[PDB]
Curated annotation (Swiss-Prot), chain A:
Quaternary context: Component of the THO complex, which is composed of HPR1, MFT1, THO2 and THP2. Together with SUB2, TEX1 and YRA1, THO forms the transcription/export (TREX) complex. THO associates with DNA and RNA in vitro.
Domain of life of the source: Eukaryota
Miscellaneous note of the record: Present with 5910 molecules/cell in log phase SD medium.
Function: Component the THO subcomplex of the TREX complex, which operates in coupling transcription elongation to mRNA export. The THO complex is recruited to transcribed genes and moves along the gene with the elongating polymerase during transcription. THO is important for stabilizing nascent RNA in the RNA polymerase II elongation complex by preventing formation of DNA:RNA hybrids behind the elongating polymerase.
Protein name: THO complex subunit MFT1
The species this protein was found in: Saccharomyces cerevisiae (strain ATCC 204508 / S288c) (Baker's yeast)
Span within the parent record: 148 to 196 of 392
Subcellular location: Nucleus
Gene for this chain: MFT1
UniProtKB/Swiss-Prot annotation, chain C:
Subcellular location per the Swiss-Prot or TrEMBL entry: Nucleus
Similarity remark: Belongs to the THOC2 family.
UniProt lineage: Eukaryota, Fungi, Dikarya, Ascomycota, Saccharomycotina
Function, as annotated: Component the THO subcomplex of the TREX complex, which operates in coupling transcription elongation to mRNA export. The THO complex is recruited to transcribed genes and moves along the gene with the elongating polymerase during transcription. THO is important for stabilizing nascent RNA in the RNA polymerase II elongation complex by preventing formation of DNA:RNA hybrids behind the elongating polymerase.
Misc: Present with 521 molecules/cell in log phase SD medium.
Residues of the full protein shown: 401 to 559 of 1597
Protein name: THO complex subunit 2
Gene: THO2
Domain of life according to the entry: Eukaryota
From Swiss-Prot, chain D:
Organism of provenance: Saccharomyces cerevisiae (strain ATCC 204508 / S288c)
Keywords assigned: Nucleus, Repeat, Transcription, Transcription regulation, WD repeat
Family: Belongs to the THOC3 family.
Name of the protein this chain belongs to: Protein TEX1
Subunit field text: Component of the transcription/export (TREX) complex and the THO complex.
Keyword Lipid biosynthesis assigned: no
InterPro entries (alphabetical): Tex1/THOC3, WD40/YVTN_repeat-like_dom_sf, WD40_repeat_dom_sf, WD40_rpt
Record's GO cellular component terms: THO complex; THO complex part of transcription export complex; transcription export complex
WD repeat segments: 49-88, 146-185, 195-234, 239-278, 281-320
Primary gene name: TEX1
UniProtKB/Swiss-Prot annotation, chain E:
Section of the entire sequence shown: 106 to 209 of 261
Gene responsible for this protein: THP2
Note: Present with 2840 molecules/cell in log phase SD medium.
GO cellular component terms attached to this protein's record: nucleoplasmic THO complex; THO complex; THO complex part of transcription export complex; transcription export complex
The protein's name in its UniProt record: THO complex subunit THP2
GO process annotations (BP): cellular response to azide; DNA recombination; mRNA export from nucleus; stress granule assembly; transcription elongation by RNA polymerase II
Subunit structure: Component of the THO complex, which is composed of HPR1, MFT1, THO2 and THP2. Together with SUB2, TEX1 and YRA1, THO forms the transcription/export (TREX) complex. THO associates with DNA and RNA in vitro.
Length: 39, 101, 159, 379, 104
């Protein structure tokens, strides 16, 4: 999925996205792409 | 005609088995009487029953009292005879020819 | 397999008691032809008896509706609990069943609309001269019906 | 032809499939011996005999751990994630519940993923954790009460909500699990059975977790509620003419099964609480007794040293193996998530487990159907 | 004309029940006291039932309601990656150390 940083915070928390990007799971293309397994 | 009914409800039986992967399923290839969303919906029943109700007011009036049968096969018209027995949607005109034979 | 005898027990499966009582009161040795005539007539008498037997054993049998439930299936992803999945089929056999994942029911669900389940003890003593006198010494082919009438008796002396 | 006629599982095509599944699970490539510590000790003395029978065998409700307690010594806890039975012993504890007495009963915890409750014969219940990284077994607490003489059995609620510890002479204890392991109630057995000095042989929890089934020595069967903290007697029926040996439950919640010391085994349904089917098993005294997880196979093992396999819907026989040359008290146990079983006793006091490549009976019929269908799509 | 109206009301009958493409069901439960589930009374979501009823209600364009699915089909993984990340590790490791420090 691809949204912006501002579209992430409407559902997530600002403390967690500050932790996702330094831990290298989110990548940017400002469209932020994540590869994840939820089923 | 019978290979569009077999391949419609064999993929979604292979899709029950993946999503809630608790239970396997082999059912029959049958008529799923109404799907899940046509079963209990009074907005879809009430506008459908008032389509059949004014198709009968055409056939109860004293104006269109000269008309063929609903299950009728044509013989004179060579165009409509090929258009009745080749469309793979109705399949009630290719069952009369099997019963007649 | 065919004929009068097969006709006489499909009528007793569905709902018809009055044309079958009138035949077996005329020819009472129409039994000793099939052992199914005493099973299906014990399916009708056990429907009339069952509201009474649940109330006589009052507090115990009323919460016995809650004791019959099964165990969920517990897988070890996050150690979660999910219920079991079955699916109905409507068959022609009168007795309810449950296979490995399929449960079977009788197709004609309005089979007991003419019948009425009787009241406490004064109605059991009147309706047993009709039903229980047709199958005289054949109530011992239904041993679960012989166990139910004997618990009505002990619970009625004590109260 | 008779396979592909029915496309759903009926009453007759099910009873013919389950007689081929039990026939093919006794084969040569479908059995492997558990590499125990006694299988090492027996194999040395047999290549170049002291009996220690097992006292309990229990499965975790997830179906991924198996613990069991020999007579003289130790607990042994196996860990199976998916690899059949050759994955890992994690622990075995030579002085488990003390260094003076024996380990009689076991129960796993349904809520917590790794915790047992081993009950000695003294007065004390020791709850202990089985560590996942290292191969150790550390304690958590130790329970006790006043006027506690000798506890034998312990059972957890199938919801993990209560704990029932019982003596066979004096009393019966409830310990709450949610707030803290604290005594809630206590009932004297003389109030349960009014007739004589009875000895409690077996107990069981219902599938909901609100009634307790108690089997005495005189043949009485008591059913008693456990609502929140009250422990009162609901009914009391006389079932057998002998000690009620074992009590089981249907996994679909329909009926329950009792066995006794005469050759007698009933199937009582749970709605009307009357007997429903009777198995004609006039050979010997039934010792162990268990059902499948689909609820179709019933395994009876008597004191003639012979095992049987029945149906629960009918009472017909499927298979019968005779194991007469051994000196075991052999234990059947079915897995809780798949349709395999672990029958105890191979040489002296051992445990083998009988496998296949398919898990259920339903994925076995579904593979037999698709192999026949290719032949009808061949002609 | 009657020979055309009779043939198009037999393929309308043969399209409501016989071939009749339907949904694939995911089972969701919320109460822990059910333990049995028959797969006949599975109904879809409340937000999907309101969208699917708008294809057959009169006086509507088809392409305007086909874009209400593309809205709905992307709002269903914007709520499955919002509970599939905050439940992934930020609430896993809050229960990792805290269940060790309870045991000690």
């Amino acid at each position: 999925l691809v949204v912006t940083r501002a579209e992430w915070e409407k559902e997530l928390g600002t403390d967690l996205v500050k932790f996702l990007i330094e831990k290298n799971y989110l990548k940017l293309v400002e469209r932020y792409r994540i590869y994840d397994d939820f089923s | 005609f019978y290979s569009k009914i077999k391949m419609n409800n064999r993929t979604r039986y292979s899709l029950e088995e993946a999503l809630n992967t608790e239970y396997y399923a082999n059912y029959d290839v049958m008529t799923p009487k109404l799907p899940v969303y046509m079963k209990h919906s009074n907005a879809m029943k009430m506008d459908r029953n008032e389509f059949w109700a004014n198709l009968q007011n055409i056939k109860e009036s004293d104006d269109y009292t000269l008309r063929p049968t609903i299950m009728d096969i044509s013989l004179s018209n060579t165009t409509c005879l090929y258009k009745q027995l080749t469309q793979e949607d109705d399949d009630y005109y290719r069952k009369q020819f099997i019963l007649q034979l | 397999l065919f004929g009068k005898i097969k006709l006489l027990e499909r009528l007793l499966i569905h709902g018809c008691v009055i044309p079958v009582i009138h035949v077996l009161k005329q020819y009472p040795k129409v039994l000793y032809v099939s052992e199914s005539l005493s099973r299906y007539l014990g399916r009708v008498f056990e429907y009339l008896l069952n509201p009474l037997y649940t109330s006589m054993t009052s507090s115990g049998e009323s919460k016995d509706m809650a004791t019959a439930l099964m165990i969920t299936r517990i897988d070890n992803g996050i150690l979660a609990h999910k219920p079991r999945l079955i699916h109905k089929y409507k068959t022609h056999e009168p007795f309810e069943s449950l296979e490995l994942n399929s449960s079977y029911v009788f197709y004609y669900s309005e089979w007991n609309s003419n019948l009425t389940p009787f009241a406490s003890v004064n109605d059991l003593f009147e309706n047993s001269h009709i039903y229980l006198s047709i199958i005289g010494p054949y109530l011992g082919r239904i041993p679960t019906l012989l166990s139910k009438i004997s618990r009505i008796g002990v619970a009625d002396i004590q109260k | 032809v008779d396979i592909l006629n029915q496309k759903t599982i009926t009453s007759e095509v099910a009873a013919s499939v389950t007689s081929k599944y039990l026939q093919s699970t006794f084969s040569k490539g479908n059995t492997s011996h558990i590499e125990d510590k006694r299988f090492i000790h027996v194999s040395s003395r047999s290549h170049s005999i002291t009996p220690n029978e097992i006292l309990s065998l229990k499965f975790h409700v997830s179906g991924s751990s198996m613990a069991y307690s020999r007579m003289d010594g130790s607990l042994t806890v196996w860990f199976i994630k998916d690899a059949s039975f050759d994955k890992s012993v994690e622990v075995y504890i030579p002085d488990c519940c003390g260094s003076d007495k024996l380990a009689t009963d076991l129960s796993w915890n349904p809520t917590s993923l790794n915790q047992i409750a081993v009950v000695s014969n003294s007065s004390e219940i020791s709850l202990l954790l089985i560590n996942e990284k290292s191969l150790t077994a550390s304690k958590l607490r130790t329970l006790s009460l006043g006027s506690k003489t000798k506890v034998n059995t312990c059972l957890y609620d199938p919801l993990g909500n209560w704990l029932l510890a019982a003596t066979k002479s004096e009393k019966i204890y409830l310990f709450d699990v949610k707030k803290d392991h604290s005594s809630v109630c206590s009932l004297n057995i003389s109030d349960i059975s009014q007739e004589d000095n009875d000895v409690v042989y077996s107990l069981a929890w219902s599938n909901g977790g609100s009634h307790i089934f108690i089997g005495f020595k005189s043949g009485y069967l008591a059913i008693l509620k456990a609502k929140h903290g009250i422990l009162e007697v609901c009914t009391k029926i006389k079932a057998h003419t002998g000690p009620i040996t074992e009590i089981k439950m249907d996994p679909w919640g329909r009926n329950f099964i009792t066995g006794s010391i005469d050759g007698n085994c009933y199937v009582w349904n749970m709605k009307s609480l009357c007997c429903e089917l009777i198995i004609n098993d006039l050979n010997s005294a039934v010792t162990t007794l268990d059902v499948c997880h689909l609820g179709k196979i019933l395994g009876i093992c008597t004191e003639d040293e012979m095992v049987y396999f029945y149906d629960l819907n009918s009472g017909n026989l499927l298979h019968s193996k005779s194991l007469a040359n051994y000196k075991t008290d052999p234990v059947l146990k079915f897995y809780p998530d798949k349709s395999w079983y672990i029958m105890s006793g191979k040489n002296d006091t051992l445990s083998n487990h009988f496998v296949k490549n398919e898990k259920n009976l339903i994925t076995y019929w579904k593979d037999m159907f698709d192999n026949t269908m290719i032949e009808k799509r061949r002609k | 004309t009657f020979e055309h109206l009779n043939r198009d009301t037999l393929r309308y009958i043969n399209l409501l029940k016989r071939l009749s493409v339907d949904l694939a069901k995911q089972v969701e439960v919320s109460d822990p006291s059910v333990t049995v589930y028959e797969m006949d009374k599975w109904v879809p979501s409340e937000k999907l039932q309101g969208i699917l009823e708008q294809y057959c209600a009169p006086d509507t364009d088809i392409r305007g309601v086909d874009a209400q699915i593309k809205n709905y089909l992307d709002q269903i993984k914007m709520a499955r990656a919002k509970f599939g990340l905050e439940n992934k590790y930020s609430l896993k490791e809050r229960l990792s150390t805290l269940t060790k420090e309870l045991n000690h």
